[PDB]
């Protein structure tokens, strides 16, 4: 609790990994008591090893009618690049090479640590897929903040709620509508978790030293690197709300409407004509509450989905997933 933060998996792991009296070390395997969320999405490589430098269109008028033989005057079109870059994160793992051998095996530690530490890594990447701008970098999403236009362009993703309490340490959340096809960019050096790599051999080293030069060990390192993109902007749509108080007021009745969900399926649409996946994002506490207000009376969840397989999502008929976007943010992005 006081001395350091337990630097190195020492003995406790080897007696908890475990064999437990196997058979082979690492009884396949273990489960993770952590929330999970769909990513998913898609990856592309991007020019040129950073950023991506995009396109848009912005203003392309105007054809004229042919009266007589007059076709006078030309016209043309302009454009402007945009996009952002990524941000790197990587961590290393250590054990004692002499103690991977009861019983002798690497697959235990190597594969188990790869899978579990993959779970934790993914937990963090989803942790920051929704936030981050002014910090030690990656990446960006809060850029939907302003509540009115002209300070930016709000509107099309700004359907909003009417209250959003923000007195002290509170709160509110949001729900999301997006599409993908607007990829996540990774530098041309592959996207997977790799690592995957073990520049191991020797060790090197302890806490300097402790006056003692350490000994052989097992090193590995992990490496991950992604970065969202907005190939266009006219696609995503969120709402600030609510929070839990005014939504408790509705068994199914009137205090805060459930109507604006349709706005989310309608403020979108622009091409996209096609296109690919598309999705709807809620967290968890919002999900079951949405059901409580929807299936008790007025509205009608039109269908259910036997999707892909995989399982069930429902409505409409676009799959809805579960996220860890938690239950408390601030106001700001209200509208």
């Amino acid at each position: 609790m006081a001395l350091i933060g337990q630097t190195l998996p020492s003995l406790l792991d080897i007696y908890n990994r475990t064999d437990k009296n196997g058979r082979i070390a690492r009884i396949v395997e273990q489960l993770a008591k952590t929330n999970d969320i769909l990513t998913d999405a898609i990856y592309v490589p991007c020019n040129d090893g950073s950023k991506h430098k995009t396109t848009i269109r912005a203003g392309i008028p105007e054809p004229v009618w042919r009266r007589y033989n007059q076709g006078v005057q030309p016209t043309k079109t302009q454009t402007v690049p945009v996009t952002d870059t990524t941000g790197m994160l990587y961590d290393l793992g250590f054990v004692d090479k002499a103690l991977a051998d009861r019983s002798n095996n690497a697959a235990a530690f190597r594969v188990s640590e790869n899978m579990g530490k993959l779970q934790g890594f993914n937990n963090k990447v989803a942790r920051y897929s929704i936030y981050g701008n002014t910090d030690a970098e990656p990446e960006a999403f809060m850029g939907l903040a302003p509540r009115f236009n002209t300070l930016s362009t709000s509107k099309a993703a700004s359907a909003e709620n009417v209250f959003s309490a923000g007195g002290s340490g509170s709160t509110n959340t949001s729900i999301w509508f997006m599409s993908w096809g607007e990829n996540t960019a990774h530098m041309i050096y592959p996207e997977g978790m790799v690592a995957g790599f073990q520049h191991e051999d020797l060790g090197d080293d302890l806490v300097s030293d402790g006056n003692g030069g350490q000994f052989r060990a097992y090193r590995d390192e992990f490496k991950w690197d992604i970065g969202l993109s907005v190939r266009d902007w006219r696609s995503i749509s969120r709402i600030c709300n609510i929070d839990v108080t005014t939504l408790t007021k509705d068994a199914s009745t009137g205090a805060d409407l459930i109507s604006m969900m349709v706005d989310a399926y309608y403020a979108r649409d622009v091409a996209m004509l096609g296109d690919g996946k598309e999705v709807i994002y809620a967290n968890k506490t919002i999900h079951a509450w949405l059901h409580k207000q929807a299936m008790n009376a007025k509205n009608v969840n039109l269908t259910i989905e036997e999707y892909g397989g995989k399982k069930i999502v429902s409505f409409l008929g676009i799959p809805i997933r579960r996220v860890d976007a938690i239950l408390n943010t601030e106001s700001a992005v209200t509208a």
Partner: protein
């Protein structure tokens, strides 16, 4: 990104500049092509402006500088010819503010 060079914070208090500390950004070169950066978060009140200068190892010679007013979050752009030392930034000035400066290197931008 990235270490060497600059890091936040300073933190630009009430009444002083922030010429400190980077020693050294090295003393031989010239500069004309690529990018830089600078911004931070919470402010307090009114007019602030950064700058830059350089010489051989210490001080003091020419500058470039810029001007801005009160708001939270910003960023301008690059630099023209310079010898090499870049003691920047050198922010200013008055009112009563006590928080957070900036740092430089690649984008950036918005979404």
């Amino acid at each position: 990104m990235k270490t060497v060079n600059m890091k936040t914070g300073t933190d630009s208090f009430v009444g002083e500049d922030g010429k400190p500390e980077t020693k050294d950004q090295y003393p031989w070169g010239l500069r004309i092509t690529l990018d830089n950066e600078s911004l931070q978060r919470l402010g307090l009140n009114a007019k602030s402006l950064p700058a830059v200068g350089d010489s051989v190892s210490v001080m003091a010679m020419a500058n470039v500088c810029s001007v801005s007013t009160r708001t939270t979050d910003h960023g301008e752009d690059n630099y023209v010819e310079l010898q090499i030392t870049d003691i920047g930034l050198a922010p200013q000035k008055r009112d009563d503010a006590k928080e957070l400066k900036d740092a430089f290197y690649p984008d950036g931008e918005d979404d």
